[PDB]
């Protein structure tokens, strides 16, 4: 039976995860093993740099966090979450953490370099994706959330800026800064305005259903070319999110609108992904009837496009950023807070 095969897959994946979750890797490289090349992108907490490993010549993407800034911004526990989770997961659509380490000043997470750029860039440039193309990407996120949620993990920052396109045209999810292992509910106000579920905005307890809401926002944005709730300032976005009103482009199919209303339910107890049948309400929806879930997992479906590749170390699929010096103090900062990193 197909359903038993999925249960067995997830049970073994949890056994594998828990071993790494309980005994995390630590201190697996050092800064002078790498030459720093160029900044690939930024987030609210730090930057990610293209680096080259001196001995092998391999390129990687290195996230750098300033320990004192993390402390000042009250992100200590979130940063410990990020690294502990990312070193423990293993999934086709999650970026691989290759090394991690810290020094007197900074924390470092060295990932596989995903060269095709952010989905964001491609989506803005082309305007919108066709429904088949949006469906190809969406299916990868559905499987990824099935995996993460089965491990008690909530992701909490889905958006095109965090979905990188690999050389086969498939997604790699990056930025686990808000990911958290939780059984039952949590309360932190975090995420990106356009993607926040109503229960986050309204300061309610919330659960994995916020990721399913965010999937609704993502699919809408991919297929429309703009988000379902947009404005010039966050507060106006929040008013629209909580209203229960959503409007769809005239070109959206019947099945797409039906799926989206089910994911964009303002009452989390009525939201797809959070009903008795869980993820299967999504996987069995008419909009996904042509999706071969195992073929997607195995990366056997033809991709909408292959990013352009001009040799190793090429960053032409990414914007340019102002560069700043990575300084390392002679004195250790915030040692006790980051002991476990």
């Amino acid at each position: 039976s197909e359903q038993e095969s999925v249960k067995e897959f997830l049970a073994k994946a949890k056994e594998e995860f828990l071993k790494k979750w309980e005994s995390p890797s630590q201190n697996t490289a050092q800064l002078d093993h790498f030459d720093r090349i160029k900044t690939l992108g930024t987030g609210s907490f730090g930057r990610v740099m293209l680096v080259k490993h001196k001995e092998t010549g391999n390129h990687y993407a290195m996230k750098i966090l300033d320990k004192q800034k993390v402390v000042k911004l009250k992100q200590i526990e979130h940063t410990l979450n990020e690294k502990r989770i990312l070193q423990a997961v293993n999934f086709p659509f999650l970026v691989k953490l290759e090394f991690s380490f810290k020094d007197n000043s900074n924390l470092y997470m060295v990932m596989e370099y995903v060269p095709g750029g952010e989905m964001f860039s491609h989506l803005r440039r082309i305007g919108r994706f066709s429904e088949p193309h949006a469906r190809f990407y969406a299916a990868q996120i559905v499987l990824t959330f099935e995996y993460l949620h089965s491990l008690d993990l909530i992701y909490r920052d889905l958006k095109p800026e965090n979905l990188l396109i690999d050389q086969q045209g498939y997604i790699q999810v990056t930025d686990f800064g808000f990911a958290k292992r939780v059984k039952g509910r949590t309360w932190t106000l975090c995420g990106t305005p356009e993607y926040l579920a109503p229960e986050i905005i309204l300061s309610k307890g919330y659960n994995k259903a916020v990721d399913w809401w965010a999937l609704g926002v993502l699919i809408y944005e991919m297929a429309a070319g703009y988000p379902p709730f947009f404005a010039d300032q966050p507060i106006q976005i929040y008013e629209k999110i909580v209203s229960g009103k959503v409007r769809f482009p005239s070109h959206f199919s019947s099945d797409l609108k039906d799926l989206l209303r089910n994911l964009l339910q303002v009452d989390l107890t009525k939201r797809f992904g959070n009903l008795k049948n869980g993820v299967n309400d999504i996987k069995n929806h008419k909009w996904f009837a042509t999706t071969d879930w195992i073929a997607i997992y195995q990366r056997k479906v033809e991709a909408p496009f292959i990013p352009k590749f001009k040799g190793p170390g090429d960053t032409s699929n990414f914007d340019d950023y102002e560069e700043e010096e990575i300084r390392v103090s002679i004195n250790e900062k915030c040692g006790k807070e980051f002991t476990e990193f």
Binding site: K159, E161, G191, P193, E194, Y226, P234
Partner: peptide, 18 residues
């Protein structure tokens, strides 16, 4: 059009977390 209203808005670039 809704598209034109989005393209003229202030939130068409990369969006940061709150």
């Amino acid at each position: 059009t809704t598209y034109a209203d989005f393209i003229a808005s202030g939130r068409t670039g990369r969006r940061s977390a709150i």
